[PDB]
Amino acid sequence: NRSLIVTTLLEEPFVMFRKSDRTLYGNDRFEGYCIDLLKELAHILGFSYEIRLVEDGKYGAQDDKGQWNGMVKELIDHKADLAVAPLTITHVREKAIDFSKPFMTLGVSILYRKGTPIDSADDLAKQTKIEYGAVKDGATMTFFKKSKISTFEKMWAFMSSKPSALVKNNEEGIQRTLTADYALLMESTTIEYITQRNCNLTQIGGLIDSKGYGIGTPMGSPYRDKITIAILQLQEEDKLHIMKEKWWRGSGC
Amino acid sequence: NRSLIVTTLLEEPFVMFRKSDRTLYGNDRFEGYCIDLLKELAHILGFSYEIRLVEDGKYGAQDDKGQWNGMVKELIDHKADLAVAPLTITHVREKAIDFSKPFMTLGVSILYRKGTPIDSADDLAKQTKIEYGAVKDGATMTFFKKSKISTFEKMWAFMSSKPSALVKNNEEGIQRTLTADYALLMESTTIEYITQRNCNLTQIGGLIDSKGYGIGTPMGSPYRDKITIAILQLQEEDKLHIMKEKWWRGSGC
Numbered sequence: 001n002r003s004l005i006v007t008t009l010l011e012e013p014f015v016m017f018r019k020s021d022r023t024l025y026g027n028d029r030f031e032g033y034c035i036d037l038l039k040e041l042a043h044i045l046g047f048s049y050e051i052r053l054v055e056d057g058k059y060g061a062q063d064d065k066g067q068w069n070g071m072v073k074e075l076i077d078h079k080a081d082l083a084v085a086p087l088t089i090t091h092v093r094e095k096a097i098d099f100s101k102p103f104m105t106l107g108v109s110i111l112y113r114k115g116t117p118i119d120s121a122d123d124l125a126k127q128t129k130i131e132y133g134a135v136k137d138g139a140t141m142t143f144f145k146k147s148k149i150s151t152f153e154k155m156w157a158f159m160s161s162k163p164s165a166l167v168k169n170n171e172e173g174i175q176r177t178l179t180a181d182y183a184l185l186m187e188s189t190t191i192e193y194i195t196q197r198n199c200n201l202t203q204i205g206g207l208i209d210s211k212g213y214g215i216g217t218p219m220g221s222p223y224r225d226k227i228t229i230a231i232l233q234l235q236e237e238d239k240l241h242i243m244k245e246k247w248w249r250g251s252g253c
Numbered sequence: 254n255r256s257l258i259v260t261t262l263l264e265e266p267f268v269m270f271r272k273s274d275r276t277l278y279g280n281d282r283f284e285g286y287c288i289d290l291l292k293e294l295a296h297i298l299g300f301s302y303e304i305r306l307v308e309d310g311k312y313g314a315q316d317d318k319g320q321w322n323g324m325v326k327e328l329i330d331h332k333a334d335l336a337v338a339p340l341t342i343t344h345v346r347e348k349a350i351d352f353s354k355p356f357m358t359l360g361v362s363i364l365y366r367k368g369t370p371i372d373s374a375d376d377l378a379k380q381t382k383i384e385y386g387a388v389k390d391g392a393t394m395t396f397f398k399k400s401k402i403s404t405f406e407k408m409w410a411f412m413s414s415k416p417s418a419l420v421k422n423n424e425e426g427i428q429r430t431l432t433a434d435y436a437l438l439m440e441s442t443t444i445e446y447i448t449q450r451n452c453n454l455t456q457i458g459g460l461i462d463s464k465g466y467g468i469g470t471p472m473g474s475p476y477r478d479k480i481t482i483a484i485l486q487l488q489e490e491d492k493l494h495i496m497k498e499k500w501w502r503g504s505g506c
């Protein structure tokens with residue numbers, strides 16, 4: 001009955017440093033939608049945890065030798081018991097680690113500065129002018145690296161080519177959409193949040209696919225099922241919809 | 254340490270009635286790639302099983318009230334412990350049941366009678382003449398019912414419309430490709446097998462996506478993990494590639 005190791009990274013509004021005048025330490029340093037989720041699971045399931053930020057600051061992708069990085073690596077290597085973060089359940093990652101049932105559903109879409117009236121990814125694929133891209137070693141990059149659709153094959157061709165098109169993280173990518181003629185391939189529910197705070201930014205097109213965020217565990221983890229079940233209970237009483245509204249509630253445009 | 258209930262259905266060359274002069278009963282009635290897989294898992298993991306054919310003869314899809322049928326229903330309702338069959342791991346079904354790690358990877362493609370030189374699904378979507386379709390209440394139908402791609406949205410529009418375009422099973426669909434101007438949306442590894450036996454049939458286009466076949470269990474099943482691990486062991490020694498060659502080895506064209 002020890003404290004579980006939780007791996008995570010910084011992403012508004014899922015995991016953040018809470019603001020204080022004193023210097024925070026431990027779990028107390030963190031807040032956000034996933035912190036509220038983790039707290040709720042800990043309570044329902046009766047466990048405690050120590051939260052640790054993944055050292056490379058990545059979600060996780062396979063390299064060209066088949067090696068993982070990011071939080072995925074952390075679970076593979078059993079350095080963490082859970083990955084609590086906006087981690088995308090992909091069948092590609094399901095060969096290295098396990099997921100709980102999804103706690104949020106989102107799609108890939110396009111974040112872009114209002115102005116040039118593009119309306120779809122076809123518009124981007126067919127031109128070099130507006131540069132686009134994704135977060136390096138994330139699920140949105142991999143989705144493009146793996147796709148058989150000739151549009152997304154065409155788009156990945158472009159990100160593959162350009163050195164500056166694959167950004168280190170979400171924050172840096174949002175910055176590029178604000179300071180360059182640049183379109184960031186991003187996840188839907190984050191686009192929602194971003195475009196509520198940043199009124200010169202908008203979503204382009206609708207969803208480019210459908211997927212879910214899950215809690216990551218090593219393969220054959222004994223908490224996988226307990227967590228899945230609690231997440232489903234929370235979901236059926238629409239608590240997760242309420243938790244989402246709490247952290248997405250913002251100004252307006 | 255009781256015998257597990259296995260749910261299954263008839264599909265060449267995964268599950269079949271073996272040929273005998275006497276009347277078979279029990280597990281002895283069955284043979285095929287999945288039978289060989291089930292046998293191997295039983296041996297590695299030390300369990301026994303009673304195989305039962307799902308009464309409605311379906312893999313499983315949600316109706317318009319959210320209700321499941323087929324083998325998916327069988328696991329939900331705990332009538333079976335495992336689904337051993339060419340069952341497609343879809344995130345849609347992962348809300349009702351669990352999957353093991355995949356034992357085979359396949360994509361959707363098009364099975365069609367050689368003649369009219371179509372080369373892609375775009376060709377089908379854009380015309381009414383050659384009728385196409387899929388197996389009713391299967392993963393390939395659902396994939397079309399759920400898709401956001403305007404081509405597959407267009408194709409699903411057509412299957413949705415036509416009463417005869419959604420076939421009862423694989424067998425009946427293959428029959429329609431042979432006796433009508435008709436293209437069956439099917440899974441890759443089955444197309445391989447079919448087109449080796451039936452030389453007026455061919456595959457049109459490449460893969461339309463990527464996915465896997467897994468062993469289905471109810472949610473939070475205690476064999477899910479044991480089975481996943483054994484399947485991975487089998488896979489790393491490339492036994493599953495050998496098992497596949499055993500059942501796909503056929504004449505030629």
Ligand SMILES: CN(O)C(=O)CC[C@H](C[C@H](N)C(=O)O)C(=O)O
Pocket residue numbers: 011059060086087088089135137138139140141169170185186187190
């Ligand atoms: C919310 N969030 O996480 C972001 O927008 C950051 C980048 C995401 C990460 C993704 N969820 C993964 O699991 O790789 C992306 O690759 O699009």
Ligand SMILES: CN(O)C(=O)CC[C@H](C[C@H](N)C(=O)O)C(=O)O
Pocket residue numbers: 264312313339340341342388390391392393394422423438439440443
């Ligand atoms: C091998 N096989 O099973 C077939 O071709 C028959 C129909 C498949 C079933 C699919 N694997 C499912 O899990 O729904 C399809 O929906 O395309």
Ligand SMILES: [Cl-]
Pocket residue numbers: 051052053
């Ligand atoms: Cl830390």
Ligand SMILES: [Cl-]
Pocket residue numbers: 304305306
């Ligand atoms: Cl039976």
Ligand SMILES: [K+]
Pocket residue numbers: 019020021022023024
């Ligand atoms: K501080």
Ligand SMILES: [K+]
Pocket residue numbers: 001002003046047048
């Ligand atoms: K504890």
Ligand SMILES: [K+]
Pocket residue numbers: 272273274275276277
């Ligand atoms: K017989």
Ligand SMILES: [K+]
Pocket residue numbers: 254255256299300301
């Ligand atoms: K037994």
